[PDB]
Design a binder for this molecule. Structure first.
Ligand SMILES: CCCCCC(=O)CC(=O)N[C@H]1CCOC1=O
Ligand SMILES: CCCCCC(=O)CC(=O)N[C@H]1CCOC1=O
Lengths: 86, 235, 235, 87
């Protein structure tokens, strides 16, 4: 709450842009693991053990993704707006 | 009594049926030794998996800011492979480095000292179990039997793998990472447009993903979608 | 080096999906360290379980004599917690005691010396991993890392439980009742109409069920479906 | 083995007509359990033991089904044709 408020607008903007880039990089990475899990659960050629690994990946990534999103949300709050990320 | 409490923990772990029972057992051990928190961490590549009793807000910060690459404890764990004591009161600051920020934030969250049990797993996987305290010098590394500490770490590792195996989720019923991000931003008060600007997902597609999230969780509206997601611990 | 082969064993065990693969991994480690056979033993109060590569004739004698009660190796294993070297050479060679007969037989079966890794589990349960050799003295107890030794014992222990577990089949992977019937009648040379007439399943839906069966078994044609089903012993 | 050869056409036909109805009955019942088993596993709620009970019932039924169907096929071969049995 006060972790970011103490920074100036120009310091926050730089952090936000960087955090938004990570937010998107993680999204593309996680969505791909999920599609492989979804595909595998319908492929009779995959064993339960291999399938369980994909399930655990999805779960670990979900927790990390929420954490990074919470960190970005707090930055946004102190910044006041959503910067453009090219 | 440390090693005695350890043998007792080992028995408690064997009877533990779920994650909650393991936490109770680990927490009791922690208290008996003078600590108040524990954390199990597994790291493969850039992927970190945890099971702990550290405060929720610290997990968001640690996992969300990739502190695994700056934490002196993970660094210590791979430089040496045996039980060790560590204290933030040993990571000098004298500046505003990312290291001082990490140290001060850990302290503000009650993590000041601890003992860690490090084990190198298969395929370069790293795992460790640590007990932390907000006080300055709670060190049991001198009396903890090394072989028994490793045993405990392996037990926690496999017990968790076994409990994870007890639940087989069907991806068709789980929200995709896409739907998930849109659901969390909505829960944070962002419109479809603000969400699109954050995620890179088109504004109209965002609304479509929320609709899919609703069908998967049987919600009639987004406020309900959020309600049901909160109840299930999804978010 | 012993630890280099141990690190390899650990990776091999992680990848083991069944007992056969675990046995091959443990055999590779044993060979690399200068040993020939290995044996995992677990004692839970009364019952005793083992997973080993000792010769068939020696196992029948061992069980058919309850040699567990006299094996100096087991008695010593519970008498200590470090990796130790043992040799049948230190047991009675003359006289008529039961150990003298145990000595002669063990040696006649190639189990002359070895190193054993002992670990006390939960509830007083006892576990141990031994590597034996028909030779005079092959002793790695002085180079093997105590902590890794325990890690290895724990993996073998849990790996074996995660196998002794029930079969557990996936419905999606099994042929459904109406699918199995269409396939069997097809293998009997029946047409879709005769199959319908027999099972009650509609004619045009028969080919639909056959295509479904092919997908589950990964067959490009009905004749291949029959060949696969025959090989898996389903028809 | 081939004691169906010593049977008259009338005996064989009766055997086939009742074997066909039985065949159809087992199919209906077996399909129901399979679908239920399919549903249950599809639920992360149902426990492991309750999922195993359904698996065993499936493995057991599939066994009897094979035995019953093989027998019907032998009767039909000895008969030399497939009698028309109403639904
Ligand atoms: C989010 C849970 C993180 C667990 C991290 C871990 O295993 C090692 C550790 O104790 N790091 C300590 C030191 C300062 O803060 C910590 O948390
Ligand atoms: C046959 C399975 C028995 C395994 C017994 C075991 O773990 C300990 C052991 O190596 N005892 C040795 C010493 C002489 O004969 C043995 O077998």
């Amino acid at each position: 709450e006060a972790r970011y408020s103490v920074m100036t607008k120009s310091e926050l903007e730089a952090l936000a842009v960087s955090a938004i880039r990570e937010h998107r990089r993680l999204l593309w990475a996680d969505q791909a693991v999920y599609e492989e899990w979804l595909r595998a659960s319908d492929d009779p050629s995959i064993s339960g053990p291999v399938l369980q690994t994909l399930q655990d990946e999805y779960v670990a990534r979900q927790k990390r993704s929420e954490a990074q999103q919470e960190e970005l949300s707090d930055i946004l709050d102190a910044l006041g707006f959503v910067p453009d990320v090219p | 009594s440390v090693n005695g409490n350890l043998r007792s923990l080992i028995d408690m772990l064997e009877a533990a049926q779920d994650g909650h029972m393991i936490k109770i057992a680990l927490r009791s051990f922690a208290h008996s030794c003078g600590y108040d928190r524990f954390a199990y961490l597994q790291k493969d590549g850039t992927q970190v998996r945890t099971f702990h009793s550290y405060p929720g807000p610290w997990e968001s910060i640690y996992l969300g800011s990739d502190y695994f690459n700056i934490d002196p404890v993970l660094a210590e764990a791979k430089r040496r492979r045996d039980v060790f004591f560590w204290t933030a009161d040993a990571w000098p600051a004298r500046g505003s480095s990312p290291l001082r920020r990490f140290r001060d934030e850990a302290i503000s969250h009650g993590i000041r000292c601890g003992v860690t049990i490090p084990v190198e797993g298969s395929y370069g996987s790293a795992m460790m179990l640590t007990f932390a305290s907000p006080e300055r010098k709670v060190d049991i590394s001198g009396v903890l039997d090394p072989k028994k500490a490793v045993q405990l770490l392996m037990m926690v590792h496999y017990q968790l793998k076994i409990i994870a195996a007890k639940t087989v989720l069907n991806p068709k019923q789980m929200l995709s990472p896409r739907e998930m991000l849109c659901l969390v931003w909505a829960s944070k008060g962002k419109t479809a447009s603000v969400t699109a600007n954050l995620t890179g997902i088109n504004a109209r597609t965002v609304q479509h993903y929320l609709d899919k999230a609703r069908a998967k969780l049987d919600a009639e509206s987004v406020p309900q979608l959020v309600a049901i997601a909160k109840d299930r611990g999804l978010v």
